[PDB]
Design a protein around this ligand. Structure first.
Ligand code: F5F
Ligand code: F5F
Lengths: 458, 447
């Protein structure tokens, strides 16, 4: 591919998006804080968007050239993370007013970062379109920075990656690989590289047991796990894997009066999303208890739910105490479970299921991709705006959704030696748990990286 | 700005590059291993290139949207670094044939990385155009990965940042700032967060004293400093700060028969580049000695130089032993020196200079930009401005010296002020920055 070929492809993708926004009288995305944070969910818009990102990243890569890419990368990449580290730890998103500029001098006093160093930090952020300088000596928000205003969940995601995953796990993953090999054992991780055998600590042990800190209303024991739960909510409120996309990948309203068992449902934010939109559903959120869990669980659930979402302490490997429920639901649980642990969980579910009335629903990454929601299946436009070679838009070796999938694949690899699966690996795994399992649906909305898979016992 | 405006701007810049390459019958850049690794040095091509990168990065950012940018960045960014970490530590660049595919199974046996994890590593590399998969189960090089074949300097740059700068310094820079403030003391850095007052360790002390390792022909003491020296060479051999760009920013041949004193010249690769192109110049490389330095210095020195490049041990803060030389040369030295330390070095140079026969030349970042060589839209020159690609590289180096030694980059006015404090006779006669380069060649004289 050449520079001109990529630039020509990019124009094709923009025409699709630009036309849709104009024909529907929808605001254009910009870098202003008032910009829309997402493009429309229309499948053709999203397919064009995903290819546009892929082509645009390739264009910048090709124009930088082979000589400068590795050179520039090792110099700059790590400092985009450190810039977000400064912005989070110094609470700079909240200190910069959303709709009006602020001078470096005033911002320096508000956050307690010396002005000279503050200017250097902000200048790096500008290059990735986080904040801008509208006039000399002044800082203003952009769309990318304004989304984090007043949102501790965004700050949780910054700090969890830069202060935990990266220094403790991903930076030591090479050493972990040469010491233990290609492992699926959560003990074979960074923090245990120099641990005496028997004294290893697991990632989730550190999360729930460390008490030397505080986070967003939780003081002492488990503050890291509470921050981890905040980052789980962060991916539910917006973006690729937003919770409301669940409503588009399964006919929740078709269940009528029904009970859903949310195995491993964190704090129930996902259950809360589906239940608010479906007044006839009951959700039992099953999760391991924590000293702060029950008080926080009930402070944050919307009161209009009238107790339809409730918390039941439960060990996911133990016998399922709710028998014959309409749906047993696991969201991004099994991608942290090797085959033998996942088969244990799936067999616990099968025991409680009525094969003629119960469904098993999982949201997980399907590495080779799920299917679009039926109405989006037929490609009504040009292939250049919906297909990269033989792969669906967003997939393939340089696909943007492929990239996000691998990023999550690496995330569970780093912390617990988990892994993502293909569709055939999922079907094989469920059939090992019980040969009666059959995949009736594998729905992945365009722009989403996770698929909602509905399993039944035939 | 909107998606359509950026895409239209991109077409304008690509047109410049596409036309120049066609009208001069030059090969197009691609991702194939045989691709040209750089675009032509023509200033207009480079200006279009720099704006093109800036416009393309804005386009991908805008298309990702505000909701997904922060969510995706903190998920994937750090794993682009880790992927290169695996590729370097497992020697995968060299194990994949340049012009031939290799299967995952065969590559796994060659590098000792189980095939399943190898596939996961390679798949992430693909998304940033490092390697590709031309057929199921097979790996091939791209242009971005082929540049590192047989090049230990490339691997040194990967390992220096991910195994040293990032875990020891940049990761801890927030903590460093809250413990010591906006400091300029090289002791007030990451590794010393829990050090007792007085027993702090300096970055270059760790570099030259650690012996628990080995790198590229150096075993034991100083292996990290030798690896650091390799990464300094790495930026000379190609790309933005390539050594040959010096030949375009100063009339070296105009010096005639002359001697250059290279203060802080690492291993002399920069001197070797200028001296090979100018047979009438002598270079004295002045640098702090190391047990492995002298043997390594002369083995890597091109024999064609006939000793015109020589090593003289010297403390940059001490009296300059070479009097009245034609040029006193410091490349990316002073950006690691606070004002008072830098003034000390400059005054050492002034003492040895003949004001009527000596020049002082520095290569350093000019944060607001230098001027282009003779021959060569908003308020900023291409590559500069708050989202400029060269601005980004400048800040990255600014952050690099900030992390390791609490250094900082300067604007042109800050440079002039600093030299005049050292000696009021100093005058900036030239501040030449080739387009596509981030460093400027500054020529100082004593009036
Ligand atoms: C906190 C939730 C994040 C959400 C993203 C989507 C995926 C990621 C594996 C997940 C996560 C864990 O599940 C567990 C540990 N560390 C994590 O980062
Ligand atoms: C090793 C040389 C690199 C080259 C790049 C161009 C500039 C960077 C500040 C430099 C560097 C040092 O000078 C010193 C310590 N650590 C570094 O990374």
């Amino acid at each position: 591919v050449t520079l001109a070929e990529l630039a020509s492809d990019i124009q094709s993708q923009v025409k699709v998006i630009d036309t849709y926004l104009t024909e529907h009288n929808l605001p254009q995305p910009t870098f202003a804080p008032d910009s829309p944070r997402e493009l429309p969910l229309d499948a053709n818009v999203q397919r064009a968007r995903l290819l546009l990102i892929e082509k645009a990243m390739a264009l910048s890569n090709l124009a930088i050239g082979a000589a400068d890419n590795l050179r520039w990368h090792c110099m700059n990449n790590k400092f985009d993370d450190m810039t977000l580290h400064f912005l989070a730890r110094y609470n700079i998103f909240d200190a910069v007013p959303r709709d009006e500029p602020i001078s470096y001098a005033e911002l320096s006093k508000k956050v307690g970062l010396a002005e000279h160093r503050l200017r250097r930090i902000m200048s790096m952020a500008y290059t990735q379109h986080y904040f801008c300088t509208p006039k000399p000596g002044f800082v203003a928000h952009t769309s990318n920075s304004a989304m984090a205003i007043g949102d501790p969940l965004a700050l949780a995601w910054i700090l969890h990656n830069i202060e935990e995953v990266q220094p403790w796990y991903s930076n030591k993953l090479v050493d972990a690989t040469m010491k233990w090999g290609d492992s699926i054992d959560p003990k074979h991780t960074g923090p245990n590289l120099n641990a005496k055998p028997g004294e290893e600590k697991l990632f989730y042990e550190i999360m729930e047991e460390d008490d030397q800190g505080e986070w967003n209303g939780v003081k002492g024991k488990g503050f890291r796990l509470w921050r981890l739960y905040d980052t789980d909510k962060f991916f539910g409120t917006g973006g690729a894997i937003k919770g409301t996309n669940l409503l588009r990948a399964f006919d929740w309203g078709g269940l009528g009066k029904a009970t859903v068992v949310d195995i491993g449902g964190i704090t129930g934010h996902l259950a809360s999303t589906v239940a608010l939109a479906n007044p006839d559903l009951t959700f039992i959120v099953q999760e391991r208890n924590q000293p702060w869990y029950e008080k926080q669980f009930y402070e944050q659930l919307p009161a209009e739910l009238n107790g339809r979402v409730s918390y039941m302490p439960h060990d996911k490997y133990a016998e399922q105490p709710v028998k014959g429920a309409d749906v047993y639901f696991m969201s991004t649980v099994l991608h942290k479970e090797p085959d033998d642990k996942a088969i244990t969980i799936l067999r616990r579910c099968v025991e409680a299921m009525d094969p003629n009335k119960s469904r098993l629903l999982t949201r997980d990454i399907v590495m080779d991709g799920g299917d679009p929601p039926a109405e989006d299946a037929v490609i009504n436009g040009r292939a250049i705006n919906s297909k990269e070679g033989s792969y669906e838009a967003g997939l393939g070796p340089t696909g943007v959704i492929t990239r996000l999938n691998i990023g999550i694949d690496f995330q569970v690899l780093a912390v617990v030696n988990g892994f993502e699966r293909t569709r055939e690996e999922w079907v094989t795994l469920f059939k090992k748990a019980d040969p009666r399992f059959a995949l009736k649906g594998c729905i992945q909305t365009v722009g989403n990286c996770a698929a909602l898979m509905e399993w039944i016992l035939e």
